[PDB]
Ligand binder design. Structure first.
Ligand SMILES: CC(=O)c1ccc2c(c1)N(CCCN(C)C)c1ccccc1S2
Length: 182
């Protein structure tokens, strides 16, 4: 079935992130870690990928976001640029939604799409359908209602799970993103 056990890829993790020993959780740090400047590491935002690669098929996983004032989740091409600033956009190889400022939910279309959520999600489900060209986001707290779906994605190559526990703000928002047991 589509449920997949995601683990986080340490080689991609921005130095402002702290990964748990089992690589199932990630949070913002108060200072940057001193770690290699390898080509796969996001250097400008607190972002990290899952280790898993998807070339085809249906895949599903869930993330706990309880109480966080900001986070971003989704899928991206493995080929996305890792160094420098960029637009989180489905024109740039990312299919993502996010929260910031405690109550501003947006989908990473270009331009961005505001999302009106009646129930703030505590857990989010991410469903990837490679052949259908779809990435769908579900509000587990609201009985699995649809938050947003990207369609007509027309994927090539491997895709990766994408995560951010927030941006750097002054040590705020330090609770982790946690991959839920499935
Ligand atoms: C849209 C875009 O390219 C974009 C690029 C990077 C980031 C981002 C938006 N925001 C949303 C804006 C935060 N700014 C205003 C500080 C975000 C949200 C949750 C977690 C991490 C991040 S960092």
């Amino acid at each position: 079935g589509p449920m997949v056990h995601i683990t986080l890829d340490p080689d991609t993790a921005n130095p402002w992130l702290i990964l748990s020993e089992d690589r199932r959780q990630v949070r913002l740090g108060d200072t940057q870690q001193s770690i290699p400047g390898n080509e796969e590491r996001f250097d400008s935002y607190p972002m990290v990928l899952g280790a898993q690669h998807f070339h085809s098929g249906k895949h599903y996983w869930e993330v706990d976001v309880t109480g966080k004032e900001a986070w971003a989740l989704g899928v991206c091409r493995d080929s996305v640029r890792r160094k420098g600033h960029f637009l989180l956009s489905s024109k740039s190889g990312f299919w993502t939604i996010w929260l910031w400022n405690k109550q501003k939910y947006e989908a990473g279309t270009y331009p961005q799409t505001p999302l009106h959520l009646q129930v703030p999600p505590c857990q989010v489900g991410i469903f990837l359908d490679y052949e259908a060209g779809m990435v769908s986001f579900y509000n587990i707290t609201d009985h699995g209602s649809l938050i947003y779906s990207f369609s007509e994605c027309a994927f090539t190559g491997p895709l990766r799970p994408f995560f951010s526990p927030g941006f750097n703000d002054g040590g705020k928002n330090t609770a982790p993103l946690t991959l839920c047991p499935l």
